[PDB]
Design an enzyme around this catalytic site. Structure first.
Site, PDB file in Angstrom:
ATOM      1  N   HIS A  41      -0.271   5.895  -5.313  1.00  0.00           N
ATOM      2  CA  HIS A  41      -1.298   5.244  -4.515  1.00  0.00           C
ATOM      3  C   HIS A  41      -1.472   5.888  -3.149  1.00  0.00           C
ATOM      4  O   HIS A  41      -2.255   5.364  -2.380  1.00  0.00           O
ATOM      5  CB  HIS A  41      -1.026   3.730  -4.403  1.00  0.00           C
ATOM      6  CG  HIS A  41       0.124   3.354  -3.518  1.00  0.00           C
ATOM      7  ND1 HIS A  41       1.364   2.997  -4.015  1.00  0.00           N
ATOM      8  CD2 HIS A  41       0.202   3.200  -2.173  1.00  0.00           C
ATOM      9  CE1 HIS A  41       2.167   2.686  -3.009  1.00  0.00           C
ATOM     10  NE2 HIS A  41       1.485   2.797  -1.881  1.00  0.00           N
ATOM     11  N   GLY A 143       3.783   1.614   5.337  1.00  0.00           N
ATOM     12  CA  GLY A 143       4.194   2.995   5.511  1.00  0.00           C
ATOM     13  C   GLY A 143       5.536   3.342   4.899  1.00  0.00           C
ATOM     14  O   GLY A 143       5.925   4.522   4.918  1.00  0.00           O
ATOM     15  N   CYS A 145       6.421   3.116   1.722  1.00  0.00           N
ATOM     16  CA  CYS A 145       6.379   3.566   0.341  1.00  0.00           C
ATOM     17  C   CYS A 145       6.782   5.033   0.254  1.00  0.00           C
ATOM     18  O   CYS A 145       6.544   5.825   1.167  1.00  0.00           O
ATOM     19  CB  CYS A 145       4.990   3.336  -0.245  1.00  0.00           C
ATOM     20  SG  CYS A 145       4.698   1.577  -0.581  1.00  0.00           S
TER      21      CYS A 145
HETATM   22  C1  LIG Z   1       3.530   1.210   0.694  1.00  0.00           C
HETATM   23  O1  LIG Z   1       3.767   1.792   1.699  1.00  0.00           O
HETATM   24  C2  LIG Z   1       3.269  -0.294   0.762  1.00  0.00           C
HETATM   25  C3  LIG Z   1       4.538  -1.039   1.192  1.00  0.00           C
HETATM   26  C4  LIG Z   1       4.310  -2.596   1.420  1.00  0.00           C
HETATM   27  C5  LIG Z   1       3.416  -2.799   2.515  1.00  0.00           C
HETATM   28  C6  LIG Z   1       3.435  -4.206   2.924  1.00  0.00           C
HETATM   29  C7  LIG Z   1       4.714  -4.517   3.611  1.00  0.00           C
HETATM   30  N1  LIG Z   1       5.953  -4.221   2.773  1.00  0.00           N
HETATM   31  C8  LIG Z   1       5.755  -3.232   1.632  1.00  0.00           C
HETATM   32  O2  LIG Z   1       6.652  -2.938   0.913  1.00  0.00           O
HETATM   33  N2  LIG Z   1       2.865  -0.681  -0.583  1.00  0.00           N
HETATM   34  C9  LIG Z   1       1.575  -1.342  -0.753  1.00  0.00           C
HETATM   35  O3  LIG Z   1       0.908  -1.576   0.195  1.00  0.00           O
HETATM   36  C10 LIG Z   1       1.103  -1.726  -2.149  1.00  0.00           C
HETATM   37  C11 LIG Z   1       0.041  -0.734  -2.613  1.00  0.00           C
HETATM   38  C12 LIG Z   1      -0.340  -1.007  -4.071  1.00  0.00           C
HETATM   39  C13 LIG Z   1      -1.328   0.033  -4.613  1.00  0.00           C
HETATM   40  C14 LIG Z   1       0.931  -1.039  -4.920  1.00  0.00           C
HETATM   41  N3  LIG Z   1       0.515  -3.055  -2.072  1.00  0.00           N
HETATM   42  C15 LIG Z   1       1.392  -4.227  -1.994  1.00  0.00           C
HETATM   43  O4  LIG Z   1       2.570  -4.122  -1.995  1.00  0.00           O
HETATM   44  C16 LIG Z   1       0.775  -5.613  -1.900  1.00  0.00           C
HETATM   45  N4  LIG Z   1       1.389  -6.469  -2.902  1.00  0.00           N
HETATM   46  C17 LIG Z   1       0.532  -7.380  -3.654  1.00  0.00           C
HETATM   47  O5  LIG Z   1      -0.641  -7.410  -3.414  1.00  0.00           O
HETATM   48  C18 LIG Z   1       1.208  -8.303  -4.691  1.00  0.00           C
HETATM   49  C19 LIG Z   1       2.123  -7.792  -5.624  1.00  0.00           C
HETATM   50  C20 LIG Z   1       2.740  -8.658  -6.545  1.00  0.00           C
HETATM   51  C21 LIG Z   1       2.430 -10.059  -6.520  1.00  0.00           C
HETATM   52  C22 LIG Z   1       3.051 -10.949  -7.459  1.00  0.00           C
HETATM   53  C23 LIG Z   1       2.744 -12.314  -7.430  1.00  0.00           C
HETATM   54  C24 LIG Z   1       1.830 -12.811  -6.483  1.00  0.00           C
HETATM   55  C25 LIG Z   1       1.219 -11.942  -5.575  1.00  0.00           C
HETATM   56  C26 LIG Z   1       1.538 -10.547  -5.603  1.00  0.00           C
HETATM   57  C27 LIG Z   1       0.920  -9.668  -4.663  1.00  0.00           C
HETATM   58  C28 LIG Z   1       1.141  -6.117  -0.524  1.00  0.00           C
HETATM   59  C29 LIG Z   1       0.797  -7.604  -0.367  1.00  0.00           C
HETATM   60  C30 LIG Z   1       0.513  -5.234   0.547  1.00  0.00           C
END
Ligand SMILES: *C(=O)[C@H](C[C@@H]1CCCNC1=O)NC(=O)[C@H](CC(C)C)NC(=O)[C@@H](NC(=O)c1ccc2ccccc2c1)C(C)C
Ligand SMILES: *C(=O)[C@H](C[C@@H]1CCCNC1=O)NC(=O)[C@H](CC(C)C)NC(=O)[C@@H](NC(=O)c1ccc2ccccc2c1)C(C)C
Lengths: 306, 306
Positions: A41, A143, A145
């Site tokens: 991503h 940031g 990831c």
């Molecule tokens: C990468 O750098 C980043 C790290 C995140 C950022 C937020 C703070 N802590 C972290 O570990 N990863 C992301 O932003 C990813 C990107 C996508 C393409 C994987 N997005 C998320 O992690 C989002 N997660 C969700 O939207 C979400 C996942 C799973 C569930 C399960 C049940 C209910 C809700 C749900 C939401 C976050 C919210 C940015």
């Protein structure tokens, strides 16, 4: 003596961390030989993450859309390839600091160290467990990831985790270094739902042995139990069943305590049913399940703090 | 989001660790430029440690009694000197891996990372606090002496601790890198007695702010308090007094929570008097005092997990 949540020394992994930027997005990559591994991503916009088509996003990029930086020096990408949820960027320069390494896929209940990074720079190191529901309880910001989890055997780094996302419960999810997620998750900003978490019974027992190893003995009682009867009690308190393989794994600690595994199981059974009555074990008021038996021996075997 | 006991990345310190052997005894040394620093009791026999005369033991050794090894390569000692409780061995080779560094003497209540070493090789890294009684709660075996504690500012390593000994309570004591002990201790195998330990109040408050920062808000009440009245309640539960300097230090977290420091003090006062009634904060059933305010901001400032 003493017992602490101990991470592996992070030096060998620190030398592998790079910054990967694809237009709008920046995250961390892992530079080994002439390949940089990072979450796919990195190619998404904020818009895209709600339900991205990664193959269509990757199709529109060439090697030169990927800016990779190791400190002050830019690395030229000369090839790109997607493996499951991980991007692999071939670079023109092999990493002089590449340690001896493996890619392993860990099992629930095992622990590893996380080197948390931002913009390719290390922030901190901490120890994590893969939970039975295939989440981890980490500490990750925007940031982070591309940060990796690892074990060190003696000179070999076993990379087992790359960080991809956060679940609203405060828990984290990611892939092995072949891009396959741990658990039933996908790299998409959408509700997904994990299994209910359970307590890693074999790890609690290992920690009780460490407590004994460290002079904390009040919880030891004069009883034994059978494996089947212990498992019937533990099951109610949301503990994983203990297998004979688990009993075997605890052999070194048992034979380094003269406390039979089933005797320690009888002590844990009493703790589960009666609580701790205000007392602590190794300074903790709750039972700890994020130390494996190998973790305990690795840290304690020179102690005896009886 | 998430909050973990996080250590500094240990890479820069790993490159400084060496093995120091003086006849019978082996421990770790810290190699910076062309000087190796290690505990002076490397020159003792087991016999000697009951009450050594270090100057008489050092008088009888020359440069060649000190075997210093960095990996597979031996370093020739070309001068030796005792500063307080630390030995300084001049060596013929400056350490190519010497980071930018300082020697600092920390204050009670501050935290640092420990890189635990045996035979000059790193075993693990963990985060510690200097307790109000000038002990630390570490994890140290035979052979760990000469392990160091450190903070990293951005590229500068501030070395603050060198490990010397263990007290039967399971607690540890050591020196700054100028060889002066923290606390009223001496490097001798004899009963010595420390002050009673107290809870680092400003650190508990910082951790409560981290909890708020991480969605854990149940403990917040609708009250405020005065600094004087809070201190009268905290004093009974063996908490350090909170000073106005402490209140100032918590300003960033307060203004990054919109919770006034004295309002958080009113919440902590209620927790101390009523307990937690079975609940947890950030997964802990006890209040945590080994995160400084800077620790919290360092780890959390990109979160908001409200
Ligand atoms: C990468 O750098 C980043 C790290 C995140 C950022 C937020 C703070 N802590 C972290 O570990 N990863 C992301 O932003 C990813 C990107 C996508 C393409 C994987 N997005 C998320 O992690 C989002 N997660 C969700 O939207 C979400 C996942 C799973 C569930 C399960 C049940 C209910 C809700 C749900 C939401 C976050 C919210 C940015
Ligand atoms: C250095 O490598 C070694 C590290 C020790 C070894 C034991 C396991 N954990 C450690 O941290 N340091 C020592 O062996 C030192 C050497 C002397 C010269 C400093 N010896 C000790 O630490 C002994 N400590 C005591 O004997 C002792 C200190 C303070 C008190 C205070 C009150 C009551 C008793 C008391 C004993 C230990 C016991 C080896």
């Amino acid at each position: 003596s003493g017992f602490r949540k101990m991470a592996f020394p992070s030096g060998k992994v620190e030398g592998c961390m790079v910054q990967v930027t694809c237009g709008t997005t920046t995250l961390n990559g892992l530079w080994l030989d002439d390949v940089v591994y990072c979450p796919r991503h990195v190619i998404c916009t904020s818009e895209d993450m709600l339900n991205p088509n990664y193959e269509d996003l990757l199709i529109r990029k060439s090697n030169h859309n990927f800016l990779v930086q190791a400190g002050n020096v830019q690395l030229r990408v000369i090839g790109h390839s997607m493996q499951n949820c991980v991007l692999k960027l071939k670079v023109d320069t092999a990493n002089p600091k590449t340690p001896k390494y493996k890619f392993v896929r860990i099992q629930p209940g095992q622990t590893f160290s996380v080197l948390a990074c931002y913009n390719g720079s290390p922030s901190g190191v901490y120890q994590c467990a893969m939970r039975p529901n295939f989440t981890i309880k980490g500490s990750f910001l925007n940031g982070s990831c591309g940060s990796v989890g690892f074990n060190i055997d003696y000179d070999c780094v076993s990379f087992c985790y790359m960080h991809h996302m956060e679940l609203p419960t405060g828990v984290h999810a990611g892939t092995d270094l072949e891009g396959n997620f741990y658990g039933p998750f996908v790299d998409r900003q959408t509700a997904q739902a994990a299994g209910t978490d359970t307590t890693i019974t074999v790890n609690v027992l290992a920690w009780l042995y460490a407590a004994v190893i460290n002079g904390d003995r009040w919880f030891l009682n004069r009883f034994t139990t059978t494996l089947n009867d212990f498992n019937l009690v533990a099951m109610k308190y949301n503990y994983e069943p203990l297998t004979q393989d688990h009993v075997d794994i605890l052999g070194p600690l048992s034979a380094q305590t003269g406390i039979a595994v089933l005797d320690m199981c009888a002590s844990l059974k009493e703790l589960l049913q009666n609580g701790m009555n205000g007392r602590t074990i190794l300074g903790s008021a709750l039972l700890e399940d994020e130390f494996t038996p190998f973790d305990v021996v690795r840290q304690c075997s020179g102690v005896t703090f009886q």
